[PDB]
Tab-separated table of C-alpha atoms and ligand atoms in Angstrom:
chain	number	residue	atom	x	y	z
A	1	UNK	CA	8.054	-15.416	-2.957
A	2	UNK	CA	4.001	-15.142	-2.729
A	3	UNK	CA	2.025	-11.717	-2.328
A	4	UNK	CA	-1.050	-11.589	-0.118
A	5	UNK	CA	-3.826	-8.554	-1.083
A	6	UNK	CA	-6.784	-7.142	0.271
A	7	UNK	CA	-9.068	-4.430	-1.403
A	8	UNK	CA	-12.523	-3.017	0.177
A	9	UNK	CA	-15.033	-0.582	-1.789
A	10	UNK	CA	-18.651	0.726	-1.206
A	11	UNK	CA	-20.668	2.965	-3.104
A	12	UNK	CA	-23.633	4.112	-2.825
A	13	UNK	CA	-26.953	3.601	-5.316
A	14	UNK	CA	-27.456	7.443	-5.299
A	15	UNK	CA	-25.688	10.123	-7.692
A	16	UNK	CA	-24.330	13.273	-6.232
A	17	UNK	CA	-24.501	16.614	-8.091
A	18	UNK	CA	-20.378	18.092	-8.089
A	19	UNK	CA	-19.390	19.870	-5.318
A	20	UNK	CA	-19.210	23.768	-6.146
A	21	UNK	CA	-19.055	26.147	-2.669
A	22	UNK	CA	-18.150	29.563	-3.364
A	23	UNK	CA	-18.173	28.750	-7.097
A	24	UNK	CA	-15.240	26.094	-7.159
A	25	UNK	CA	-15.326	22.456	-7.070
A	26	UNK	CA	-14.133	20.370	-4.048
A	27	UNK	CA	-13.974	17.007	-4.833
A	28	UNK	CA	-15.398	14.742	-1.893
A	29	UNK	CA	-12.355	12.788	-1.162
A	30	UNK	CA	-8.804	11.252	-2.729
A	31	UNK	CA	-9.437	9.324	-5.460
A	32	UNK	CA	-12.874	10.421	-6.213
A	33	UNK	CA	-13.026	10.379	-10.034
A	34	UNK	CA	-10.790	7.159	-10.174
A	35	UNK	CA	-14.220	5.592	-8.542
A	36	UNK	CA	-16.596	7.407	-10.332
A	37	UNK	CA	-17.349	4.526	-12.423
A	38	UNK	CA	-18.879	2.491	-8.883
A	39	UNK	CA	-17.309	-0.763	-10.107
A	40	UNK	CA	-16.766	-2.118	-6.011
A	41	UNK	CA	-15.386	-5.500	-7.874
A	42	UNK	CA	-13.124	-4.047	-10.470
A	43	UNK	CA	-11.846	-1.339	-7.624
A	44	UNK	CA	-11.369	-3.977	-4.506
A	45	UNK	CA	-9.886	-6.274	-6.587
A	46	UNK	CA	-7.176	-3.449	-7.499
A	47	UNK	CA	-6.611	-2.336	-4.728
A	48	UNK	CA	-6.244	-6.156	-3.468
A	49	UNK	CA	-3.396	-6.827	-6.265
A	50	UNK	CA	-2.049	-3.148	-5.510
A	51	UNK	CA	-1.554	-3.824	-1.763
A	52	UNK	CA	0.183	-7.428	-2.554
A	53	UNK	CA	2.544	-5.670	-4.812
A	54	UNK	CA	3.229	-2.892	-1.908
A	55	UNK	CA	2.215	0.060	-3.957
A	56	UNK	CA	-1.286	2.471	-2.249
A	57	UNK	CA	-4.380	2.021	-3.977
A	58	UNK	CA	-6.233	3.395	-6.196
A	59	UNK	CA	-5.780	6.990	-4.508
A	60	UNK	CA	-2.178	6.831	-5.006
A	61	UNK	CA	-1.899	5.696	-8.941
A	62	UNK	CA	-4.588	7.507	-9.845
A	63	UNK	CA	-5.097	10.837	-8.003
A	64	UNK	CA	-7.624	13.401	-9.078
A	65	UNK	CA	-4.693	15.498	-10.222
A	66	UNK	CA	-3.295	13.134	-13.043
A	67	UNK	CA	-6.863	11.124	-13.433
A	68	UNK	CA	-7.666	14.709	-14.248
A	69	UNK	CA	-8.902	13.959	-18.289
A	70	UNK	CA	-7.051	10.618	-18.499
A	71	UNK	CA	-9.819	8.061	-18.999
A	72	UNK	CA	-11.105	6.462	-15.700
A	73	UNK	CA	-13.157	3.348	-16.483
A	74	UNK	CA	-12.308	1.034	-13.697
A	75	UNK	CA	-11.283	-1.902	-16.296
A	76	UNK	CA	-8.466	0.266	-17.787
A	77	UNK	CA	-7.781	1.227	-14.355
A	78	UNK	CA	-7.704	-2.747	-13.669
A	79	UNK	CA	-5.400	-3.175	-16.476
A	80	UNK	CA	-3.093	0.020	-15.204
A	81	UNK	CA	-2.434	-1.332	-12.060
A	82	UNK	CA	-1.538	-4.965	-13.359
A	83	UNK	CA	0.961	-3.271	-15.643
A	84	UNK	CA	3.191	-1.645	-12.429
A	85	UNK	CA	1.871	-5.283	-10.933
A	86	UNK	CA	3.816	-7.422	-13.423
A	87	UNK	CA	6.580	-4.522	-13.550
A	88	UNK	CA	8.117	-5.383	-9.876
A	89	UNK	CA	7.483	-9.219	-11.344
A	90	UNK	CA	4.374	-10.671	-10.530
A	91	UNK	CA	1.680	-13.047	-12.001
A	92	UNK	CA	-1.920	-13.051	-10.890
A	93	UNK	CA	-0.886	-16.120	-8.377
A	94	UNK	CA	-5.066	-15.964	-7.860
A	95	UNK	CA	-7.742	-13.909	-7.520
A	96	UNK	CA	-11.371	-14.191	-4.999
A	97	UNK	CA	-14.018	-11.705	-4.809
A	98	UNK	CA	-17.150	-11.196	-2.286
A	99	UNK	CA	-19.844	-8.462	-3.557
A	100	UNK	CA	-22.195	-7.515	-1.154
A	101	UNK	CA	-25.365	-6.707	-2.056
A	102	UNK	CA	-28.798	-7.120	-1.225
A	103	UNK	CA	-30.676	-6.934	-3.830
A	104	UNK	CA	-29.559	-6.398	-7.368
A	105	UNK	CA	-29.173	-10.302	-8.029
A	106	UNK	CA	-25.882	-10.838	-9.740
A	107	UNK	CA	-25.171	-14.602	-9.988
A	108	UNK	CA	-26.570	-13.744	-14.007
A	109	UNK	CA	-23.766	-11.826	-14.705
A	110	UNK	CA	-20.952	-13.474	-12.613
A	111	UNK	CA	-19.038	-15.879	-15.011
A	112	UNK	CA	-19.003	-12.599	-17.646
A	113	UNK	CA	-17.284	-10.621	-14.708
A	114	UNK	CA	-14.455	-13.268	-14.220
A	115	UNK	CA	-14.188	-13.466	-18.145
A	116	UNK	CA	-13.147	-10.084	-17.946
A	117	UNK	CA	-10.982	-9.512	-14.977
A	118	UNK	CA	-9.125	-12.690	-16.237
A	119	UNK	CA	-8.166	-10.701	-19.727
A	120	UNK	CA	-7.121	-7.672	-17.537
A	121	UNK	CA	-5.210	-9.573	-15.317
A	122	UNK	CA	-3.891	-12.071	-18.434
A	123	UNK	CA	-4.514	-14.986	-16.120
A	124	UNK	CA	-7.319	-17.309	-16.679
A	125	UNK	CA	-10.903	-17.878	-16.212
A	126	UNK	CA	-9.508	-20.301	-13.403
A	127	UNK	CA	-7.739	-18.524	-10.871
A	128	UNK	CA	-10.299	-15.672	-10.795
A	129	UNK	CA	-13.456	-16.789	-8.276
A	130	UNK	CA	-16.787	-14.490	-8.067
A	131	UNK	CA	-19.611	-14.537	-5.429
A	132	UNK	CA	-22.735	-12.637	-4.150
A	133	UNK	CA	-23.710	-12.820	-0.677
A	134	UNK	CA	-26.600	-10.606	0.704
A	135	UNK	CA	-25.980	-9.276	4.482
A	136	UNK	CA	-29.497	-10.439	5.068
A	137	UNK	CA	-31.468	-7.101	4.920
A	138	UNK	CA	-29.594	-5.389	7.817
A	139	UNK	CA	-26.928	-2.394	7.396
A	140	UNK	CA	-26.703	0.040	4.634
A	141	UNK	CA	-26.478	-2.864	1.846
A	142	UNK	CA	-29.309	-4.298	3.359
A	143	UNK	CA	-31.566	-1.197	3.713
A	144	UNK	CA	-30.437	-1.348	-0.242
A	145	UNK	CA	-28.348	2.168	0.423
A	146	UNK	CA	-25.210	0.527	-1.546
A	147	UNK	CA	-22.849	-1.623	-2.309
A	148	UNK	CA	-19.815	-3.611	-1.326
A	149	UNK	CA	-17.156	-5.949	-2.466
A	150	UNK	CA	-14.336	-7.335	-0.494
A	151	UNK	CA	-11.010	-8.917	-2.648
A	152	UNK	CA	-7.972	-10.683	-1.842
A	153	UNK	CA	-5.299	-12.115	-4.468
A	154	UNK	CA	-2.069	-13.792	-3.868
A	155	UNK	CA	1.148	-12.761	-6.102
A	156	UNK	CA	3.379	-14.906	-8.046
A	157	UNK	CA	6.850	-13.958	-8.564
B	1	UNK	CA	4.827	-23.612	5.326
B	2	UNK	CA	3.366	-20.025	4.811
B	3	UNK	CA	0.417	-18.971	6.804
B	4	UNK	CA	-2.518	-16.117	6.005
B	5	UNK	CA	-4.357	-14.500	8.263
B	6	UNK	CA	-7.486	-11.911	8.835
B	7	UNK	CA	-8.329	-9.375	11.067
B	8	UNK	CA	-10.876	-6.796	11.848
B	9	UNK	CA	-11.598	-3.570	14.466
B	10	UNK	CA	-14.334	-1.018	14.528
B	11	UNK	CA	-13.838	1.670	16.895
B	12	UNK	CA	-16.335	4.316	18.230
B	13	UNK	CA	-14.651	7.938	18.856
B	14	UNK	CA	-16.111	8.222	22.076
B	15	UNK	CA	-14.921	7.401	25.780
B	16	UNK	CA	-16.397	5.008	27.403
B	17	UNK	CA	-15.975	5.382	30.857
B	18	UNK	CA	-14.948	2.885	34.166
B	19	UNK	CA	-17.655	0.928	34.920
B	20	UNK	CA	-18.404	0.715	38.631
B	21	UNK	CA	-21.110	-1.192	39.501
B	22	UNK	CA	-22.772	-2.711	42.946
B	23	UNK	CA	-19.112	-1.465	44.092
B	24	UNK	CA	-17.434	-4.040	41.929
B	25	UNK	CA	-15.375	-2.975	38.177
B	26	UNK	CA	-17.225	-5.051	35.800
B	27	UNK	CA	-14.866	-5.541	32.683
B	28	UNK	CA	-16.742	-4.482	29.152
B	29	UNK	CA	-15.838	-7.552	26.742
B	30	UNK	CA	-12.294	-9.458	26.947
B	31	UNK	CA	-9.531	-7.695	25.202
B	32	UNK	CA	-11.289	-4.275	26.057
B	33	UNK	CA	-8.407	-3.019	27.556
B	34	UNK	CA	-6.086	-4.119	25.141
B	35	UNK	CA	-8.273	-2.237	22.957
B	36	UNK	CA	-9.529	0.658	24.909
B	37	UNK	CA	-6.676	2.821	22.718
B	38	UNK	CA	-8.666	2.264	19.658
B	39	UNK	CA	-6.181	1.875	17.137
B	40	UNK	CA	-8.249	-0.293	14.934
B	41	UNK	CA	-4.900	-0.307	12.572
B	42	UNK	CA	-2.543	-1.754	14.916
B	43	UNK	CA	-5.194	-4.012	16.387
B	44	UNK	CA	-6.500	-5.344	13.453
B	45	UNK	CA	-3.046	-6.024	12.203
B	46	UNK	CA	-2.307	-7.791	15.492
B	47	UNK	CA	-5.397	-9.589	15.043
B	48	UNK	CA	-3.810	-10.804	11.609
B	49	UNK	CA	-0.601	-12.444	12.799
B	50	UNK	CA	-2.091	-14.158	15.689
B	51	UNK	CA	-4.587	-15.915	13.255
B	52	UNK	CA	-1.972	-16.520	10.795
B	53	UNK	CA	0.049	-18.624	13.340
B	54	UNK	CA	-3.381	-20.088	14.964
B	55	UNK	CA	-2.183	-18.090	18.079
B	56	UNK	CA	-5.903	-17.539	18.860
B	57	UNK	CA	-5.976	-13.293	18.878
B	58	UNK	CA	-6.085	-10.010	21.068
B	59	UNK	CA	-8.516	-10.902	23.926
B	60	UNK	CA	-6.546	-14.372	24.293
B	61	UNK	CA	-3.367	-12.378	24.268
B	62	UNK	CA	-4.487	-10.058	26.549
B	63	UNK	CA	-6.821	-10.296	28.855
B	64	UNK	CA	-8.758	-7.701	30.776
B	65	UNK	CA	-6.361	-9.188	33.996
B	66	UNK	CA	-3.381	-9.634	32.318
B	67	UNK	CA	-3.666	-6.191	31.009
B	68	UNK	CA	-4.918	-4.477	33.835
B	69	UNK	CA	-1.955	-2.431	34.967
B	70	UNK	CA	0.410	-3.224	32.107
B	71	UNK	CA	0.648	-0.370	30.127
B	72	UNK	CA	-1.527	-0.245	27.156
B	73	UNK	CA	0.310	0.775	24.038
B	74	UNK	CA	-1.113	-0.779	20.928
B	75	UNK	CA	2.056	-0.899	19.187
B	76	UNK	CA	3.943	-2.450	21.967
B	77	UNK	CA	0.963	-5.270	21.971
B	78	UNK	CA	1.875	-5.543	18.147
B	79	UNK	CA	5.529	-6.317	18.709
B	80	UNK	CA	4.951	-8.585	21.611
B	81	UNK	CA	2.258	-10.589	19.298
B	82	UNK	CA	5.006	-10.752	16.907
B	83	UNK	CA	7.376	-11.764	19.563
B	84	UNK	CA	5.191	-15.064	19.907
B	85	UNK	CA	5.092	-15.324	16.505
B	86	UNK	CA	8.992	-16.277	15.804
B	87	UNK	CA	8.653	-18.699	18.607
B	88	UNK	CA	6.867	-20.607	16.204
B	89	UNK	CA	9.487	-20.537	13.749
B	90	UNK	CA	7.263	-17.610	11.615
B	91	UNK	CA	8.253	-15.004	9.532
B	92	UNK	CA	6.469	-11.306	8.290
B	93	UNK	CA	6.323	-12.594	4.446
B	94	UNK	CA	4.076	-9.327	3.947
B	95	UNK	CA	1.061	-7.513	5.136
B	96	UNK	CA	-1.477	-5.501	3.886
B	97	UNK	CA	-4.704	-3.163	6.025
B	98	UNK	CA	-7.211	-1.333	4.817
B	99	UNK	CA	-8.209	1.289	6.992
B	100	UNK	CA	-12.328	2.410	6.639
B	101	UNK	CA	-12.879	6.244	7.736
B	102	UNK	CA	-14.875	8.894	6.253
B	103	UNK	CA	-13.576	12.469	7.449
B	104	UNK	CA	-10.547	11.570	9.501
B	105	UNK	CA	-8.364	12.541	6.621
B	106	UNK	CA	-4.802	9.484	6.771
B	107	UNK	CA	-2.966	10.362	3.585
B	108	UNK	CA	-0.716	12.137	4.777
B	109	UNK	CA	0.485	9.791	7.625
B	110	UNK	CA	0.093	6.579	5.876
B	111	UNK	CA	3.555	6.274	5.385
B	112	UNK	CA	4.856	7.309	9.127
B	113	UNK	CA	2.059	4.606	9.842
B	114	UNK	CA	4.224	2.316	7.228
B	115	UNK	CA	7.339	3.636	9.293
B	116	UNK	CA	6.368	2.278	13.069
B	117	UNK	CA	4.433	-1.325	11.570
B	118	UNK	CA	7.855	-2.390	9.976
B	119	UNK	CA	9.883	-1.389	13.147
B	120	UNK	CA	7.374	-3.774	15.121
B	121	UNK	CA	7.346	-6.619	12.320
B	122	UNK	CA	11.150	-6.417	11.912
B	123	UNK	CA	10.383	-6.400	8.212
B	124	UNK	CA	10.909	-3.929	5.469
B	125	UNK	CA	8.602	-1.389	4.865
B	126	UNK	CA	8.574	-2.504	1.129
B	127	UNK	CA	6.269	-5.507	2.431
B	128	UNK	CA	4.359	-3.570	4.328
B	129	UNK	CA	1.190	-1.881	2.585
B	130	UNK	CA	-1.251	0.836	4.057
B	131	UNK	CA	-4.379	2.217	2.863
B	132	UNK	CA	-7.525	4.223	3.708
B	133	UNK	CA	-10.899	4.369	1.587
B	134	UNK	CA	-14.273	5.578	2.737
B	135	UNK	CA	-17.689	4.369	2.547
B	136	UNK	CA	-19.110	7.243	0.703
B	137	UNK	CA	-21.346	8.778	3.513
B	138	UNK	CA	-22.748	4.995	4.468
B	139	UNK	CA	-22.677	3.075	6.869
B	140	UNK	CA	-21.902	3.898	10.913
B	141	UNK	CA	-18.307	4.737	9.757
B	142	UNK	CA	-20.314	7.283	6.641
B	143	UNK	CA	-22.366	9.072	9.560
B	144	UNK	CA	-18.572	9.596	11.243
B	145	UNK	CA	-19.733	7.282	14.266
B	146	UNK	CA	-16.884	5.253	14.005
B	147	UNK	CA	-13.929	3.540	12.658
B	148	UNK	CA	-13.048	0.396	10.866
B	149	UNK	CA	-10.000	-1.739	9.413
B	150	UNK	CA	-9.576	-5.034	7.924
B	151	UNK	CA	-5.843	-6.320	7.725
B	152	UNK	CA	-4.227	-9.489	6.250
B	153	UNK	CA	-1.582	-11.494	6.884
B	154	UNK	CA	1.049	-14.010	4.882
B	155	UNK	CA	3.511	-15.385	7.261
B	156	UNK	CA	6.770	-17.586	5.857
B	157	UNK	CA	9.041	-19.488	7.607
C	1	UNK	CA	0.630	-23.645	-6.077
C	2	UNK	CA	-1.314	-21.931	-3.861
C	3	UNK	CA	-5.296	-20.735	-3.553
C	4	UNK	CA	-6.251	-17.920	-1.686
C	5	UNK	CA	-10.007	-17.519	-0.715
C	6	UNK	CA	-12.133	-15.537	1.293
C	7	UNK	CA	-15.849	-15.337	2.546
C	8	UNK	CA	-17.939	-12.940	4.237
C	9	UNK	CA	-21.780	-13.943	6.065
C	10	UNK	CA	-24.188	-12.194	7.294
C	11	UNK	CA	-27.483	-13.782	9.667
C	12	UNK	CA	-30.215	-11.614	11.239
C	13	UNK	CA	-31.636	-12.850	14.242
C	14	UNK	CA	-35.093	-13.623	13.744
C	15	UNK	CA	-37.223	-16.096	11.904
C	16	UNK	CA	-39.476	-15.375	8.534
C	17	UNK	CA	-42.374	-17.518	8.109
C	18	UNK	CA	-42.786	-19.174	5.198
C	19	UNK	CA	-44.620	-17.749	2.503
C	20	UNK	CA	-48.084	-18.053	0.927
C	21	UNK	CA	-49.477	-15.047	-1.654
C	22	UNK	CA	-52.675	-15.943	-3.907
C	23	UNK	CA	-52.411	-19.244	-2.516
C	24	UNK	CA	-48.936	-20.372	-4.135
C	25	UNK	CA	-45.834	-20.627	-1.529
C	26	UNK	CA	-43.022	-18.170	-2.501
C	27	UNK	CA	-39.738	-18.406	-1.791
C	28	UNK	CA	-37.175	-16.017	-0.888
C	29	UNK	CA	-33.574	-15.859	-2.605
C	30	UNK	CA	-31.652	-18.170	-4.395
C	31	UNK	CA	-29.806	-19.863	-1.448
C	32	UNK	CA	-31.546	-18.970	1.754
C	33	UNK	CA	-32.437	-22.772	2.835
C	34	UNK	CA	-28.553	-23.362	2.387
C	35	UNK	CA	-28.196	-20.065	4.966
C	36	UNK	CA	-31.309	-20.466	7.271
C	37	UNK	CA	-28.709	-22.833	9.254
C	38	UNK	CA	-27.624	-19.200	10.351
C	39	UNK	CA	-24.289	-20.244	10.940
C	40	UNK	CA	-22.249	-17.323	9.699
C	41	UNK	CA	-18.710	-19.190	10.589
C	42	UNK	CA	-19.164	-22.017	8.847
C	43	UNK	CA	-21.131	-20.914	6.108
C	44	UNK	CA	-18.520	-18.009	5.452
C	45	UNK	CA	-15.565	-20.822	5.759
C	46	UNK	CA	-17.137	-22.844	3.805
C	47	UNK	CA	-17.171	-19.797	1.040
C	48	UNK	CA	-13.848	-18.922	1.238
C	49	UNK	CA	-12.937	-22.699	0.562
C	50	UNK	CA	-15.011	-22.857	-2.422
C	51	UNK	CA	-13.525	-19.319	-3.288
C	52	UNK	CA	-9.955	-20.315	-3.597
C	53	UNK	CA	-10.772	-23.573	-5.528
C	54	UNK	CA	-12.699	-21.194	-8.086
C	55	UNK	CA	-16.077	-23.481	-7.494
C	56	UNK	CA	-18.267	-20.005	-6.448
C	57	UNK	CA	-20.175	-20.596	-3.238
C	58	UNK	CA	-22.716	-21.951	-1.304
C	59	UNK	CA	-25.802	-21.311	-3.617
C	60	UNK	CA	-24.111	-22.274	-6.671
C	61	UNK	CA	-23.974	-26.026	-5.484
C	62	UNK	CA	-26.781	-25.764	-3.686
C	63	UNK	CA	-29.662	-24.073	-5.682
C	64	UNK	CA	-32.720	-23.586	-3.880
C	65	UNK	CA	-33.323	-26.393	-6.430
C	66	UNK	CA	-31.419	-29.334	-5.741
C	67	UNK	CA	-31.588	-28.213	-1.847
C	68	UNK	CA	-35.704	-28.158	-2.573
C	69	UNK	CA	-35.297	-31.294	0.158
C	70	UNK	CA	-31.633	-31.300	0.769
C	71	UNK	CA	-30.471	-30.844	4.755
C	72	UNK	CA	-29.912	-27.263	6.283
C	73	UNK	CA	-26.914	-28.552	8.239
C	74	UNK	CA	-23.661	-26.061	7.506
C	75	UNK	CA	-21.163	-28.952	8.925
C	76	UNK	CA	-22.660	-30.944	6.088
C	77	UNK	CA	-22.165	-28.247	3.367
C	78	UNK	CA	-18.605	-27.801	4.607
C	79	UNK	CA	-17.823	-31.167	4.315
C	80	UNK	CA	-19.126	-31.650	0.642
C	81	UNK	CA	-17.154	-28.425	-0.139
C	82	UNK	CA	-14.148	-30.230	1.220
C	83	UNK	CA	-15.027	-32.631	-1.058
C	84	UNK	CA	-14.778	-30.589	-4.363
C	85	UNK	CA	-11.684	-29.268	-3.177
C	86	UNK	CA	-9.902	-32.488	-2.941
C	87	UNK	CA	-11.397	-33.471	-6.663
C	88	UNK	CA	-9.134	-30.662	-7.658
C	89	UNK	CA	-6.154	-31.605	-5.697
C	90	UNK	CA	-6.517	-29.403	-2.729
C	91	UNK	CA	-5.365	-29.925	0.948
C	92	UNK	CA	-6.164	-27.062	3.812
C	93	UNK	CA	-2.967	-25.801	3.928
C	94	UNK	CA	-4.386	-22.665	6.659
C	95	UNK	CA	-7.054	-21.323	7.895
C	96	UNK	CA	-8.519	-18.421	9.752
C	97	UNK	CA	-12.282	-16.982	10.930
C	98	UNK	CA	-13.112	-13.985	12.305
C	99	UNK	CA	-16.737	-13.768	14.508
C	100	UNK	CA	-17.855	-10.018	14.706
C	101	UNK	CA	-21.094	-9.867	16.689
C	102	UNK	CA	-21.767	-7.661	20.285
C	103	UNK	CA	-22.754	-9.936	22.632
C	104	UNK	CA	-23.305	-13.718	22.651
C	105	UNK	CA	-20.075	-14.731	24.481
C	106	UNK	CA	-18.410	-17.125	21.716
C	107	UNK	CA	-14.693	-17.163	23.312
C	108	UNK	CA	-15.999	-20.171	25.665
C	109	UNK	CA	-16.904	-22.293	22.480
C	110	UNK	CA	-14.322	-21.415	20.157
C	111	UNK	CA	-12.594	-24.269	20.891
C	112	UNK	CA	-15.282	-26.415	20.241
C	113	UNK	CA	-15.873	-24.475	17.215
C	114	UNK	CA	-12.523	-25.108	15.687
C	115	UNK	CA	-12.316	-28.886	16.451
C	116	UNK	CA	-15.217	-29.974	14.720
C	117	UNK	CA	-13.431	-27.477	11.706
C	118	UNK	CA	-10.905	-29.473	11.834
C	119	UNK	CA	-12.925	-32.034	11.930
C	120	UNK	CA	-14.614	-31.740	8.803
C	121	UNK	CA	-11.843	-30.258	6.908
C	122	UNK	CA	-9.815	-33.211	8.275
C	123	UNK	CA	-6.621	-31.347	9.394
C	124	UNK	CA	-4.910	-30.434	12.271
C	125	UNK	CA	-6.290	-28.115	14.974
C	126	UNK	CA	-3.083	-25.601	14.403
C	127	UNK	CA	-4.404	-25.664	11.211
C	128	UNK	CA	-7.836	-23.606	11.921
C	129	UNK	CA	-8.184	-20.790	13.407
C	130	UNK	CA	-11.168	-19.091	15.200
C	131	UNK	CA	-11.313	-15.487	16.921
C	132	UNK	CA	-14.365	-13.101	17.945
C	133	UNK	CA	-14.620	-9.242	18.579
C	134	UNK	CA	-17.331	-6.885	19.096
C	135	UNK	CA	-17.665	-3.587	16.956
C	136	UNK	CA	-17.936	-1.252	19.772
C	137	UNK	CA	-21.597	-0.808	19.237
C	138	UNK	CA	-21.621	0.516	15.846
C	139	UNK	CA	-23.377	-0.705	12.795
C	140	UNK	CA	-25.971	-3.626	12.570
C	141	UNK	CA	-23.772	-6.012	14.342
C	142	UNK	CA	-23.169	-3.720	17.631
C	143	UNK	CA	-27.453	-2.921	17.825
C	144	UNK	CA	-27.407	-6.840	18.215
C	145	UNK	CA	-29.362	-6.603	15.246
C	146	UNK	CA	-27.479	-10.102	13.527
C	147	UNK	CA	-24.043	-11.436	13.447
C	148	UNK	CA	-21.348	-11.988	10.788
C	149	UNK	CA	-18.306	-13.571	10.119
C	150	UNK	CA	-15.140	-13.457	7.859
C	151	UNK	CA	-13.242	-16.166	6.859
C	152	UNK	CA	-9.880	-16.753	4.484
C	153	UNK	CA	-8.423	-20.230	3.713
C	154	UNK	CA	-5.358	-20.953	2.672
C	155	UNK	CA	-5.041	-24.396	-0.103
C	156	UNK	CA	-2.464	-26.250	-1.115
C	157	UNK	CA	-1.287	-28.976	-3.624
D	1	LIG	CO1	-14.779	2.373	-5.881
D	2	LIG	CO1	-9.292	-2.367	18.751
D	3	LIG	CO1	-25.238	-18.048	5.720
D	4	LIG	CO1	-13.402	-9.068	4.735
């Protein structure tokens, strides 16, 4: 039996002050602190390997109610997911991942970012594939308002 | 063999209208009526299986003619795309969207939306995966002009 | 053993001269000879290839370097990704590309699109897979501003 994923994240380069109206907070959305780090690769590629394994996304492990003080560095939140991942018996089958951005040049820092995910995913630097493609100057990654990354994985097991 | 497959829909909220011109009903794009319900879920989905089994897609499925005074349910088009896909000997292995909307707020139906696609897909809803993330205020689907979903597809048998 | 891979393209319509500041000729970014082809379906097949063998993408193989002199033909950079792909042991088990641009009609030359696909990746026309939509007028792609493409290939051996 194999697993097919797909995962999608943007963010934007701009920070937000919190949300207070009427002197409480109100987040923005679902998951909202579980992507406060910005990490569109770590997050897409979790929510690829998530929706494989049949289980939400990141707004459904990690709501703002239980992400509430628990740590939410995306990397951990990799490593998180693959646990339930491997817990319905499942192996990173393979892993490939599109970031979209225009300008921050990232092919530098690419073969670091699949060292990593490899670890969290206990797979190997092999079956874990990294590129950079620019959506030449047109929409918001373009105009350089954000980001994006796109990930898919397949599921062994 | 086992077959994967991609699709994508963007949406605008607003009605278009019949367009009459010279007397004549010129015909917006191909699948536009197919389409004209704008369930970029069910679509893109569709979209999915009829790429996994090379069946071509929507506005092949369905032409503007063909579609013309058959009724123009989106989930119905889903089953019947699924329908062609057994004749080919093709199995749901599982399936995974990703559904791109700012404001219109799909948490809480995600899983009746789980419900109906396994119905359709004869499958189990255990290998069917939903999900919704936003584009933090970017993007036409940020300024709420529109919306988007991506879907993918691993068919067995 | 299976290799899942996906690419994503963008192309803008129109042309940038070539450069000349202080005298010296500047170029643009790392892989835009490879991408002045502006062939989104290709070039984004060709991606997704190289993304489920783990060999990166276009730019990586083809530096603006090497390809200081090397040919701006897509069908040829397809075909030496095929290559690397059968080094590694790796037949085109599936695949599937998605057009999304407004309003060049493609649907007449899909067809012709997918044979010489098949061509190159020397397989079977059932095999490839190529389908085109419109995004209702929203974003960059719907102001006819460029075009882009999404592609996922399926590998086996
Ligand atoms: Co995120
Ligand atoms: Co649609
Ligand atoms: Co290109
Ligand atoms: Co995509």
């Amino acid at each position: 039996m194999i697993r097919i994923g797909h995962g999608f994240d943007v963010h934007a380069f701009g920070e937000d002050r919190p949300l207070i109206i009427g002197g409480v907070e109100v987040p923005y959305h679902t998951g909202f602190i579980a992507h406060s780090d910005g990490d569109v690769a770590l997050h897409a590629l979790t929510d690829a390997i998530l929706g494989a394994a049949a289980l939400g996304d990141i707004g459904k492990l990690f709501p703002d109610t239980d992400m509430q003080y628990k740590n939410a560095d995306s990397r951990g939140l990799l490593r998180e997911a693959f646990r339930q991942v491997q817990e319905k018996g499942y192996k990173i089958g393979n892993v490939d991942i599109t970031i979209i951005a225009q300008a921050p040049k990232m092919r530098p820092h690419i073969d670091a970012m699949r060292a990593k995910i490899a670890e969290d995913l206990q797979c190997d630097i092999e079956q874990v594939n990294v590129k950079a493609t620019t959506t030449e100057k047109l929409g918001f990654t373009g105009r350089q308002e954000g980001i994006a990354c796109e990930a898919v994985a397949l599921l062994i097991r």
